[PDB]
Amino acid sequence: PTIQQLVRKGRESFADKSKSPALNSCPQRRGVCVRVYTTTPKPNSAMRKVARVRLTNSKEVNAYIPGEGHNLQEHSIVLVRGGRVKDLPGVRYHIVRGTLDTAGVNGRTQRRSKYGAKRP
Amino acid sequence: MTDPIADYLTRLRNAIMAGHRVVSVPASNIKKEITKILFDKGYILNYKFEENDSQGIIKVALKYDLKVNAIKKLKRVSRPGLRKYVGYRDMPRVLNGLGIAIVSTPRGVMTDKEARELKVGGEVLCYVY
């Protein structure tokens, strides 16, 4: 545009959206397991364990449960962090293992800190 | 016309691109000063002023090597839509000192070298190299 056009109007800059809006600019939130169910991936064909959780920030979302073997159930207090799964539409949050009701993965000897397992 | 100095630079550039030997311009005082600066700085072969019934004509014979012109780029800086003013302490260097910038100053019209020598600033008309 011309210099006078820029003087009259100016330039407008948008705002980048946050990839985890339900956290409300927090690292982790606390919730209760409203529902525990299983979903199918959008060329994978697995059975991924998910929980619908109502967070304390007045919001309900879906959180994936990483690892093999979950002791969670309905109406369980869990810690929810960011991070999405590529081959699953919907879910965009993870459940921290080893915190609150969620227990660490049993029989883990590698990648222990990502699944909350102590040194054996 | 909107910018006669830009028109003069454009005429020179088009003649250089077309590979002509001479170029004619409707005369003006600041353009007479600019072509005098160019001739004494060694970018054109020679010039001539013809004062006719109109405002006058400037005829410029350009400088070619034994077929590359002596001028490579002309860039108008201070346009009517955005005027550029600078001092001697912040004057620019064109092509890292191998090119010139025509500057209008209260002491007259000269290049950036003479302007920095005389410690004066003004309008930056064009970059020439």
Binding site: - | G42, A70, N96, L98
Partner: protein, 160 residues
């Protein structure tokens, strides 16, 4: 561009270039090579052979055949220069003596093959290797030495 017809070889990139035929897919092998002696002479070529070594050898031969002379002084450039070729644009500026080459990739390969030590280089177009190396060599070719500028203009004490 002055043609100016031992230089080491640098492989910029290779490509898995395919073809579609009724029988199936036939695959070639392309490679961009730059030859230079770190002195002011740099050439570039494109080998298009079946095997990788054969493609590299053909590119080396083509780059040796097509050479130009780039005016340089010490390990820097006489002035700043911008040049665009295709969807790629390059900008080169002189820098301080203790700075080195500040760019990576095809730009770094071309500037190493030409031997320039201190340079500030920035790419403002695309990351295509062909157009990138061609734009960089065009920028180097459009570069004028102070002696060349003085010869074109007249006197050699113009900078004073």
């Amino acid at each position: 561009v002055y043609n100016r017809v031992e230089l080491k070889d640098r492989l910029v990139a290779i490509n898995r270039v395919t073809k579609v035929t009724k029988g199936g897919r036939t695959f070639t092998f392309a490679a961009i090579v730059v030859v230079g002696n770190e002195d002011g002479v740099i050439g570039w070529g494109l080998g298009k052979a079946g095997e990788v070594p054969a493609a590299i050898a053909k590119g080396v031969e083509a780059a040796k055949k097509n050479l130009i002379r780039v005016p340089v002084h010490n390990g820097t450039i006489p002035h700043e220069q911008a040049a665009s070729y295709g969807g790629a644009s390059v900008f080169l500026k002189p820098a301080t003596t203790g700075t080195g080459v500040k760019a990576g990739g095809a730009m770094r390969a071309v500037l190493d093959s030409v031997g320039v030590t201190d340079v500030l280089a920035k790419s403002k177009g695309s990351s295509n290797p062909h157009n990138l190396v061609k734009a960089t060599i065009q920028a180097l070719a459009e570069m004028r030495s102070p002696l060349m500028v003085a010869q074109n203009r007249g006197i050699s004490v113009e900078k004073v």
